[PDB]
JSON list of N, CA, C and O and ligand atoms in Angstrom, two decimals:
[
{"chain": "A", "resi": 1, "resn": "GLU", "atom": "N", "xyz": [157.21, 8.86, 113.70]},
{"chain": "A", "resi": 1, "resn": "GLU", "atom": "CA", "xyz": [157.92, 8.24, 113.18]},
{"chain": "A", "resi": 1, "resn": "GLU", "atom": "C", "xyz": [158.76, 9.45, 112.87]},
{"chain": "A", "resi": 1, "resn": "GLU", "atom": "O", "xyz": [160.43, 9.04, 112.37]},
{"chain": "A", "resi": 2, "resn": "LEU", "atom": "N", "xyz": [157.89, 10.65, 111.67]},
{"chain": "A", "resi": 2, "resn": "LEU", "atom": "CA", "xyz": [159.05, 10.92, 110.84]},
{"chain": "A", "resi": 2, "resn": "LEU", "atom": "C", "xyz": [160.46, 11.88, 111.22]},
{"chain": "A", "resi": 2, "resn": "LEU", "atom": "O", "xyz": [161.32, 12.33, 110.96]},
{"chain": "A", "resi": 3, "resn": "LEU", "atom": "N", "xyz": [160.51, 12.02, 112.73]},
{"chain": "A", "resi": 3, "resn": "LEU", "atom": "CA", "xyz": [161.00, 13.05, 113.24]},
{"chain": "A", "resi": 3, "resn": "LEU", "atom": "C", "xyz": [161.85, 12.15, 113.90]},
{"chain": "A", "resi": 3, "resn": "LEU", "atom": "O", "xyz": [163.81, 12.54, 113.46]},
{"chain": "A", "resi": 4, "resn": "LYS", "atom": "N", "xyz": [161.93, 11.24, 113.85]},
{"chain": "A", "resi": 4, "resn": "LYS", "atom": "CA", "xyz": [163.00, 9.63, 114.13]},
{"chain": "A", "resi": 4, "resn": "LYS", "atom": "C", "xyz": [164.18, 9.49, 112.28]},
{"chain": "A", "resi": 4, "resn": "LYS", "atom": "O", "xyz": [165.39, 9.40, 113.29]},
{"chain": "A", "resi": 5, "resn": "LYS", "atom": "N", "xyz": [162.88, 9.62, 111.84]},
{"chain": "A", "resi": 5, "resn": "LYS", "atom": "CA", "xyz": [163.89, 9.74, 110.69]},
{"chain": "A", "resi": 5, "resn": "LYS", "atom": "C", "xyz": [164.68, 10.79, 110.66]},
{"chain": "A", "resi": 5, "resn": "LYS", "atom": "O", "xyz": [165.81, 10.65, 109.82]},
{"chain": "A", "resi": 6, "resn": "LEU", "atom": "N", "xyz": [164.28, 11.92, 110.59]},
{"chain": "A", "resi": 6, "resn": "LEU", "atom": "CA", "xyz": [165.51, 12.61, 110.65]},
{"chain": "A", "resi": 6, "resn": "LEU", "atom": "C", "xyz": [165.88, 13.44, 111.68]},
{"chain": "A", "resi": 6, "resn": "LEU", "atom": "O", "xyz": [167.82, 13.10, 110.48]},
{"chain": "A", "resi": 7, "resn": "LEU", "atom": "N", "xyz": [165.98, 12.67, 112.76]},
{"chain": "A", "resi": 7, "resn": "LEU", "atom": "CA", "xyz": [167.06, 12.27, 114.24]},
{"chain": "A", "resi": 7, "resn": "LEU", "atom": "C", "xyz": [168.22, 11.72, 113.44]},
{"chain": "A", "resi": 7, "resn": "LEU", "atom": "O", "xyz": [169.15, 11.30, 113.05]},
{"chain": "A", "resi": 8, "resn": "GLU", "atom": "N", "xyz": [167.96, 10.04, 113.13]},
{"chain": "A", "resi": 8, "resn": "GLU", "atom": "CA", "xyz": [168.63, 9.48, 112.76]},
{"chain": "A", "resi": 8, "resn": "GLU", "atom": "C", "xyz": [169.88, 9.65, 111.63]},
{"chain": "A", "resi": 8, "resn": "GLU", "atom": "O", "xyz": [170.48, 9.37, 111.27]},
{"chain": "A", "resi": 9, "resn": "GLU", "atom": "N", "xyz": [169.58, 10.53, 110.50]},
{"chain": "A", "resi": 9, "resn": "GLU", "atom": "CA", "xyz": [169.84, 10.87, 109.58]},
{"chain": "A", "resi": 9, "resn": "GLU", "atom": "C", "xyz": [170.90, 11.75, 109.47]},
{"chain": "A", "resi": 9, "resn": "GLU", "atom": "O", "xyz": [171.96, 12.55, 108.69]},
{"chain": "A", "resi": 10, "resn": "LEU", "atom": "N", "xyz": [171.07, 12.80, 110.27]},
{"chain": "A", "resi": 10, "resn": "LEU", "atom": "CA", "xyz": [171.63, 13.86, 111.18]},
{"chain": "A", "resi": 10, "resn": "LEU", "atom": "C", "xyz": [172.93, 12.93, 111.63]},
{"chain": "A", "resi": 10, "resn": "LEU", "atom": "O", "xyz": [173.76, 13.90, 112.47]},
{"chain": "A", "resi": 11, "resn": "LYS", "atom": "N", "xyz": [172.17, 12.19, 112.94]},
{"chain": "A", "resi": 11, "resn": "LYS", "atom": "CA", "xyz": [172.89, 11.25, 113.32]},
{"chain": "A", "resi": 11, "resn": "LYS", "atom": "C", "xyz": [174.09, 10.41, 112.57]},
{"chain": "A", "resi": 11, "resn": "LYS", "atom": "O", "xyz": [175.06, 10.00, 112.74]},
{"chain": "A", "resi": 12, "resn": "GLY", "atom": "N", "xyz": [173.89, 9.49, 111.72]},
{"chain": "A", "resi": 12, "resn": "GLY", "atom": "CA", "xyz": [174.40, 8.85, 110.39]},
{"chain": "A", "resi": 12, "resn": "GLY", "atom": "C", "xyz": [175.01, 7.69, 110.86]},
{"chain": "A", "resi": 12, "resn": "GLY", "atom": "O", "xyz": [174.33, 7.32, 111.24]},
{"chain": "B", "resi": 1, "resn": "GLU", "atom": "N", "xyz": [181.51, 11.65, 118.25]},
{"chain": "B", "resi": 1, "resn": "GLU", "atom": "CA", "xyz": [180.70, 10.38, 118.89]},
{"chain": "B", "resi": 1, "resn": "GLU", "atom": "C", "xyz": [180.01, 11.63, 120.13]},
{"chain": "B", "resi": 1, "resn": "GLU", "atom": "O", "xyz": [178.21, 10.72, 120.32]},
{"chain": "B", "resi": 2, "resn": "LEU", "atom": "N", "xyz": [180.32, 12.75, 120.78]},
{"chain": "B", "resi": 2, "resn": "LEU", "atom": "CA", "xyz": [178.80, 13.20, 121.30]},
{"chain": "B", "resi": 2, "resn": "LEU", "atom": "C", "xyz": [177.66, 13.71, 120.67]},
{"chain": "B", "resi": 2, "resn": "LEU", "atom": "O", "xyz": [176.57, 13.40, 121.69]},
{"chain": "B", "resi": 3, "resn": "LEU", "atom": "N", "xyz": [177.93, 14.10, 120.14]},
{"chain": "B", "resi": 3, "resn": "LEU", "atom": "CA", "xyz": [176.42, 14.16, 119.03]},
{"chain": "B", "resi": 3, "resn": "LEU", "atom": "C", "xyz": [176.03, 12.90, 118.15]},
{"chain": "B", "resi": 3, "resn": "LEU", "atom": "O", "xyz": [174.38, 13.41, 118.91]},
{"chain": "B", "resi": 4, "resn": "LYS", "atom": "N", "xyz": [176.35, 12.19, 118.10]},
{"chain": "B", "resi": 4, "resn": "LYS", "atom": "CA", "xyz": [175.96, 11.12, 117.75]},
{"chain": "B", "resi": 4, "resn": "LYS", "atom": "C", "xyz": [174.98, 10.37, 119.29]},
{"chain": "B", "resi": 4, "resn": "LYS", "atom": "O", "xyz": [174.04, 10.14, 119.04]},
{"chain": "B", "resi": 5, "resn": "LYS", "atom": "N", "xyz": [175.41, 10.67, 120.10]},
{"chain": "B", "resi": 5, "resn": "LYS", "atom": "CA", "xyz": [175.06, 10.70, 121.95]},
{"chain": "B", "resi": 5, "resn": "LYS", "atom": "C", "xyz": [173.13, 11.33, 121.74]},
{"chain": "B", "resi": 5, "resn": "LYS", "atom": "O", "xyz": [173.31, 10.37, 121.99]},
{"chain": "B", "resi": 6, "resn": "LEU", "atom": "N", "xyz": [173.81, 12.46, 122.15]},
{"chain": "B", "resi": 6, "resn": "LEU", "atom": "CA", "xyz": [173.08, 13.25, 121.54]},
{"chain": "B", "resi": 6, "resn": "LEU", "atom": "C", "xyz": [171.42, 12.99, 120.89]},
{"chain": "B", "resi": 6, "resn": "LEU", "atom": "O", "xyz": [170.23, 13.03, 121.40]},
{"chain": "B", "resi": 7, "resn": "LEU", "atom": "N", "xyz": [172.13, 13.04, 119.31]},
{"chain": "B", "resi": 7, "resn": "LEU", "atom": "CA", "xyz": [170.80, 12.97, 118.65]},
{"chain": "B", "resi": 7, "resn": "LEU", "atom": "C", "xyz": [170.09, 11.76, 118.66]},
{"chain": "B", "resi": 7, "resn": "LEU", "atom": "O", "xyz": [168.98, 11.45, 118.61]},
{"chain": "B", "resi": 8, "resn": "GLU", "atom": "N", "xyz": [171.62, 10.02, 119.08]},
{"chain": "B", "resi": 8, "resn": "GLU", "atom": "CA", "xyz": [170.21, 9.20, 119.99]},
{"chain": "B", "resi": 8, "resn": "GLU", "atom": "C", "xyz": [169.60, 9.25, 121.34]},
{"chain": "B", "resi": 8, "resn": "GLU", "atom": "O", "xyz": [168.73, 8.61, 121.01]},
{"chain": "B", "resi": 9, "resn": "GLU", "atom": "N", "xyz": [169.75, 9.86, 121.96]},
{"chain": "B", "resi": 9, "resn": "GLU", "atom": "CA", "xyz": [169.37, 10.42, 123.00]},
{"chain": "B", "resi": 9, "resn": "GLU", "atom": "C", "xyz": [167.50, 11.04, 122.41]},
{"chain": "B", "resi": 9, "resn": "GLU", "atom": "O", "xyz": [166.48, 10.96, 123.13]},
{"chain": "B", "resi": 10, "resn": "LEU", "atom": "N", "xyz": [167.83, 12.43, 121.52]},
{"chain": "B", "resi": 10, "resn": "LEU", "atom": "CA", "xyz": [166.50, 13.27, 121.09]},
{"chain": "B", "resi": 10, "resn": "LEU", "atom": "C", "xyz": [165.65, 11.78, 120.70]},
{"chain": "B", "resi": 10, "resn": "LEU", "atom": "O", "xyz": [164.56, 12.15, 120.21]},
{"chain": "B", "resi": 11, "resn": "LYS", "atom": "N", "xyz": [165.96, 10.97, 119.73]},
{"chain": "B", "resi": 11, "resn": "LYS", "atom": "CA", "xyz": [165.30, 10.22, 118.87]},
{"chain": "B", "resi": 11, "resn": "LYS", "atom": "C", "xyz": [164.53, 9.63, 119.50]},
{"chain": "B", "resi": 11, "resn": "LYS", "atom": "O", "xyz": [163.87, 8.52, 119.74]},
{"chain": "B", "resi": 12, "resn": "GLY", "atom": "N", "xyz": [165.01, 8.93, 121.08]},
{"chain": "B", "resi": 12, "resn": "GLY", "atom": "CA", "xyz": [165.03, 8.17, 121.80]},
{"chain": "B", "resi": 12, "resn": "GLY", "atom": "C", "xyz": [164.05, 6.58, 120.96]},
{"chain": "B", "resi": 12, "resn": "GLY", "atom": "O", "xyz": [164.86, 6.02, 120.09]},
{"chain": "C", "resi": 1, "resn": "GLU", "atom": "N", "xyz": [187.49, 27.00, 123.98]},
{"chain": "C", "resi": 1, "resn": "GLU", "atom": "CA", "xyz": [187.12, 27.70, 123.67]},
{"chain": "C", "resi": 1, "resn": "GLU", "atom": "C", "xyz": [186.26, 26.59, 123.20]},
{"chain": "C", "resi": 1, "resn": "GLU", "atom": "O", "xyz": [184.82, 26.98, 122.48]},
{"chain": "C", "resi": 2, "resn": "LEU", "atom": "N", "xyz": [186.85, 26.25, 122.55]},
{"chain": "C", "resi": 2, "resn": "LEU", "atom": "CA", "xyz": [185.08, 24.85, 121.83]},
{"chain": "C", "resi": 2, "resn": "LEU", "atom": "C", "xyz": [184.37, 23.99, 122.10]},
{"chain": "C", "resi": 2, "resn": "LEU", "atom": "O", "xyz": [183.37, 24.33, 122.00]},
{"chain": "C", "resi": 3, "resn": "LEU", "atom": "N", "xyz": [184.49, 23.62, 124.03]},
{"chain": "C", "resi": 3, "resn": "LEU", "atom": "CA", "xyz": [184.39, 23.21, 124.85]},
{"chain": "C", "resi": 3, "resn": "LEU", "atom": "C", "xyz": [183.00, 24.32, 125.40]},
{"chain": "C", "resi": 3, "resn": "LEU", "atom": "O", "xyz": [182.03, 23.85, 125.20]},
{"chain": "C", "resi": 4, "resn": "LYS", "atom": "N", "xyz": [183.63, 25.25, 125.40]},
{"chain": "C", "resi": 4, "resn": "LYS", "atom": "CA", "xyz": [182.72, 26.40, 125.63]},
{"chain": "C", "resi": 4, "resn": "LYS", "atom": "C", "xyz": [181.79, 26.58, 124.31]},
{"chain": "C", "resi": 4, "resn": "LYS", "atom": "O", "xyz": [180.05, 27.04, 125.51]},
{"chain": "C", "resi": 5, "resn": "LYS", "atom": "N", "xyz": [181.71, 26.99, 123.21]},
{"chain": "C", "resi": 5, "resn": "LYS", "atom": "CA", "xyz": [180.83, 27.30, 122.52]},
{"chain": "C", "resi": 5, "resn": "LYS", "atom": "C", "xyz": [179.76, 25.91, 122.32]},
{"chain": "C", "resi": 5, "resn": "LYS", "atom": "O", "xyz": [178.65, 26.36, 122.07]},
{"chain": "C", "resi": 6, "resn": "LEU", "atom": "N", "xyz": [181.12, 24.58, 122.60]},
{"chain": "C", "resi": 6, "resn": "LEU", "atom": "CA", "xyz": [179.88, 23.40, 122.57]},
{"chain": "C", "resi": 6, "resn": "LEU", "atom": "C", "xyz": [178.44, 23.83, 123.49]},
{"chain": "C", "resi": 6, "resn": "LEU", "atom": "O", "xyz": [177.48, 23.64, 123.17]},
{"chain": "C", "resi": 7, "resn": "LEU", "atom": "N", "xyz": [179.12, 24.39, 124.50]},
{"chain": "C", "resi": 7, "resn": "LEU", "atom": "CA", "xyz": [177.79, 23.54, 125.59]},
{"chain": "C", "resi": 7, "resn": "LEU", "atom": "C", "xyz": [176.61, 24.92, 125.36]},
{"chain": "C", "resi": 7, "resn": "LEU", "atom": "O", "xyz": [175.94, 24.71, 125.66]},
{"chain": "C", "resi": 8, "resn": "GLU", "atom": "N", "xyz": [177.30, 26.41, 125.18]},
{"chain": "C", "resi": 8, "resn": "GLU", "atom": "CA", "xyz": [176.69, 27.12, 124.75]},
{"chain": "C", "resi": 8, "resn": "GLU", "atom": "C", "xyz": [175.58, 27.13, 123.64]},
{"chain": "C", "resi": 8, "resn": "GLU", "atom": "O", "xyz": [174.12, 27.27, 123.21]},
{"chain": "C", "resi": 9, "resn": "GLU", "atom": "N", "xyz": [176.02, 26.20, 122.01]},
{"chain": "C", "resi": 9, "resn": "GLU", "atom": "CA", "xyz": [174.74, 26.08, 121.69]},
{"chain": "C", "resi": 9, "resn": "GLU", "atom": "C", "xyz": [173.68, 24.80, 121.60]},
{"chain": "C", "resi": 9, "resn": "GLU", "atom": "O", "xyz": [172.85, 24.33, 121.72]},
{"chain": "C", "resi": 10, "resn": "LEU", "atom": "N", "xyz": [174.60, 23.59, 122.73]},
{"chain": "C", "resi": 10, "resn": "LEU", "atom": "CA", "xyz": [173.60, 22.70, 123.94]},
{"chain": "C", "resi": 10, "resn": "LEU", "atom": "C", "xyz": [172.57, 23.08, 124.20]},
{"chain": "C", "resi": 10, "resn": "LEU", "atom": "O", "xyz": [171.74, 22.76, 124.30]},
{"chain": "C", "resi": 11, "resn": "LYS", "atom": "N", "xyz": [173.48, 24.22, 124.63]},
{"chain": "C", "resi": 11, "resn": "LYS", "atom": "CA", "xyz": [172.39, 25.12, 125.83]},
{"chain": "C", "resi": 11, "resn": "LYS", "atom": "C", "xyz": [170.76, 25.86, 125.44]},
{"chain": "C", "resi": 11, "resn": "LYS", "atom": "O", "xyz": [169.69, 26.24, 126.15]},
{"chain": "C", "resi": 12, "resn": "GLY", "atom": "N", "xyz": [171.21, 26.41, 124.75]},
{"chain": "C", "resi": 12, "resn": "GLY", "atom": "CA", "xyz": [170.21, 27.57, 123.76]},
{"chain": "C", "resi": 12, "resn": "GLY", "atom": "C", "xyz": [170.13, 28.60, 124.67]},
{"chain": "C", "resi": 12, "resn": "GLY", "atom": "O", "xyz": [171.06, 29.05, 125.42]},
{"chain": "D", "resi": 1, "resn": "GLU", "atom": "N", "xyz": [173.05, 25.75, 113.88]},
{"chain": "D", "resi": 1, "resn": "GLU", "atom": "CA", "xyz": [174.30, 26.36, 113.96]},
{"chain": "D", "resi": 1, "resn": "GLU", "atom": "C", "xyz": [175.09, 26.05, 114.80]},
{"chain": "D", "resi": 1, "resn": "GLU", "atom": "O", "xyz": [176.56, 26.48, 114.94]},
{"chain": "D", "resi": 2, "resn": "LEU", "atom": "N", "xyz": [174.68, 24.93, 115.69]},
{"chain": "D", "resi": 2, "resn": "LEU", "atom": "CA", "xyz": [176.44, 24.31, 116.79]},
{"chain": "D", "resi": 2, "resn": "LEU", "atom": "C", "xyz": [176.97, 23.58, 115.37]},
{"chain": "D", "resi": 2, "resn": "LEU", "atom": "O", "xyz": [178.41, 24.03, 115.57]},
{"chain": "D", "resi": 3, "resn": "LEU", "atom": "N", "xyz": [176.96, 22.66, 114.32]},
{"chain": "D", "resi": 3, "resn": "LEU", "atom": "CA", "xyz": [178.02, 22.95, 113.86]},
{"chain": "D", "resi": 3, "resn": "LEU", "atom": "C", "xyz": [178.51, 23.64, 113.19]},
{"chain": "D", "resi": 3, "resn": "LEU", "atom": "O", "xyz": [179.80, 24.19, 112.18]},
{"chain": "D", "resi": 4, "resn": "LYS", "atom": "N", "xyz": [178.36, 24.58, 112.44]},
{"chain": "D", "resi": 4, "resn": "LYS", "atom": "CA", "xyz": [179.32, 26.14, 112.38]},
{"chain": "D", "resi": 4, "resn": "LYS", "atom": "C", "xyz": [180.56, 26.83, 113.15]},
{"chain": "D", "resi": 4, "resn": "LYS", "atom": "O", "xyz": [181.30, 26.49, 113.34]},
{"chain": "D", "resi": 5, "resn": "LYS", "atom": "N", "xyz": [179.53, 26.61, 114.67]},
{"chain": "D", "resi": 5, "resn": "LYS", "atom": "CA", "xyz": [180.44, 26.85, 116.02]},
{"chain": "D", "resi": 5, "resn": "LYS", "atom": "C", "xyz": [181.52, 25.38, 115.69]},
{"chain": "D", "resi": 5, "resn": "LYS", "atom": "O", "xyz": [182.79, 26.75, 116.44]},
{"chain": "D", "resi": 6, "resn": "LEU", "atom": "N", "xyz": [181.35, 24.47, 115.72]},
{"chain": "D", "resi": 6, "resn": "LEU", "atom": "CA", "xyz": [181.65, 23.43, 115.48]},
{"chain": "D", "resi": 6, "resn": "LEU", "atom": "C", "xyz": [183.21, 24.25, 114.53]},
{"chain": "D", "resi": 6, "resn": "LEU", "atom": "O", "xyz": [184.71, 23.90, 115.19]},
{"chain": "D", "resi": 7, "resn": "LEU", "atom": "N", "xyz": [182.97, 23.56, 113.52]},
{"chain": "D", "resi": 7, "resn": "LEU", "atom": "CA", "xyz": [183.87, 24.37, 112.20]},
{"chain": "D", "resi": 7, "resn": "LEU", "atom": "C", "xyz": [184.96, 25.57, 112.21]},
{"chain": "D", "resi": 7, "resn": "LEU", "atom": "O", "xyz": [185.88, 26.35, 111.94]},
{"chain": "D", "resi": 8, "resn": "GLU", "atom": "N", "xyz": [183.67, 26.67, 113.57]},
{"chain": "D", "resi": 8, "resn": "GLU", "atom": "CA", "xyz": [184.40, 27.75, 114.00]},
{"chain": "D", "resi": 8, "resn": "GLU", "atom": "C", "xyz": [186.02, 27.67, 114.45]},
{"chain": "D", "resi": 8, "resn": "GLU", "atom": "O", "xyz": [186.81, 28.31, 114.50]},
{"chain": "D", "resi": 9, "resn": "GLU", "atom": "N", "xyz": [185.21, 26.81, 115.29]},
{"chain": "D", "resi": 9, "resn": "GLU", "atom": "CA", "xyz": [186.30, 26.64, 116.24]},
{"chain": "D", "resi": 9, "resn": "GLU", "atom": "C", "xyz": [187.59, 26.26, 116.02]},
{"chain": "D", "resi": 9, "resn": "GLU", "atom": "O", "xyz": [188.80, 26.35, 116.41]},
{"chain": "D", "resi": 10, "resn": "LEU", "atom": "N", "xyz": [187.13, 24.83, 115.09]},
{"chain": "D", "resi": 10, "resn": "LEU", "atom": "CA", "xyz": [188.66, 24.26, 114.23]},
{"chain": "D", "resi": 10, "resn": "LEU", "atom": "C", "xyz": [189.48, 25.36, 113.55]},
{"chain": "D", "resi": 10, "resn": "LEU", "atom": "O", "xyz": [190.24, 25.47, 113.61]},
{"chain": "D", "resi": 11, "resn": "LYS", "atom": "N", "xyz": [188.72, 26.31, 113.03]},
{"chain": "D", "resi": 11, "resn": "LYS", "atom": "CA", "xyz": [188.72, 27.33, 111.80]},
{"chain": "D", "resi": 11, "resn": "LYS", "atom": "C", "xyz": [189.90, 28.48, 112.47]},
{"chain": "D", "resi": 11, "resn": "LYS", "atom": "O", "xyz": [191.72, 28.58, 112.38]},
{"chain": "D", "resi": 12, "resn": "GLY", "atom": "N", "xyz": [190.02, 28.65, 113.93]},
{"chain": "D", "resi": 12, "resn": "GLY", "atom": "CA", "xyz": [190.65, 29.55, 114.95]},
{"chain": "D", "resi": 12, "resn": "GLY", "atom": "C", "xyz": [190.60, 30.78, 114.71]},
{"chain": "D", "resi": 12, "resn": "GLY", "atom": "O", "xyz": [191.50, 31.46, 115.16]},
{"chain": "E", "resi": 101, "resn": "LIG", "atom": "CL1", "xyz": [189.30, 31.99, 105.31]}
]
């Protein structure tokens, strides 16, 4: 989940 | 958009 | 060239 | 680095 949160923020 | 789609694929 | 650099960065 | 390269290609 931590990586999902990072990736969603990079996506915007 | 391409980057949004690829980041979404990496997120899974 | 923009597309070539994009593809290079995607492939690593 | 991918973002840097795209910005380089916009700058020319
Ligand atoms: Cl300059």
